[PDB]
Amino acid sequence: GVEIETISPGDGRTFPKKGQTCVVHYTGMLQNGKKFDSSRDRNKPFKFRIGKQEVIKGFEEGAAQMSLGQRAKLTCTPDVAYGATGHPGVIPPNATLIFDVELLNLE
C-alpha cells in the first residue's frame, strides 16, 4: 500500500509518463527511527526513469500519483520493498518506510 499526504503546491496536471526521466529530492526515514538515506547531502538529485523497476515498488507507484512541484509523503509497506529479506546492514527485515519526496522533474 502506497498512501500520499500532499503538501499542496504545484500544478496538479503535469503527470509523469512511461520512459520519462524524473528528478526527485528524496529523503528516507525509518518509522520510529532515524534517517537512512538522503539526496540532500550529495546534491545529486537522482535522475531516474519510469517503467524499468530500477527503484522499489512503493517508491515507484507514489511517484506516478504526483505532479510537478508537489511534495508528497510516502508510506511503504514492508511487503513491497524489503520486509521479507531486509537490506543487509541498512534496512532490517519487516520494516515500514517513510519518504519525503519532492518531484521537480524534466521532460
UniProtKB/Swiss-Prot annotation:
The principal location of this protein is: cytoplasm
Expression by tissue, per the entry, reads: Detected in heart muscle (at protein level). Isoform 1 and isoform 2 are ubiquitous with highest levels in brain and thymus.
Control of this protein's activity is summarized as: Inhibited by both FK506 and rapamycin.
Q: Which Pfam families match?
A: FKBP_C
The EC code for this enzyme is 5.2.1.8
Q: Which UniProt keywords apply?
A: Cytoplasm, Isomerase, Rotamase, Sarcoplasmic reticulum
Could you confirm whether the keyword Cytoplasm appears in this record?
Answer: yes
Which molecular function term from Gene Ontology is one that the record holds?
A: transmembrane transporter binding
Query: Might you name a Gene Ontology BP term for this protein?
Result: positive regulation of sequestering of calcium ion
Q: Which family does it belong to?
A: Belongs to the FKBP-type PPIase family. FKBP1 subfamily.
In Swiss-Prot or TrEMBL terms, this protein is called: Peptidyl-prolyl cis-trans isomerase FKBP1B
Species, as recorded: Homo sapiens (Human)
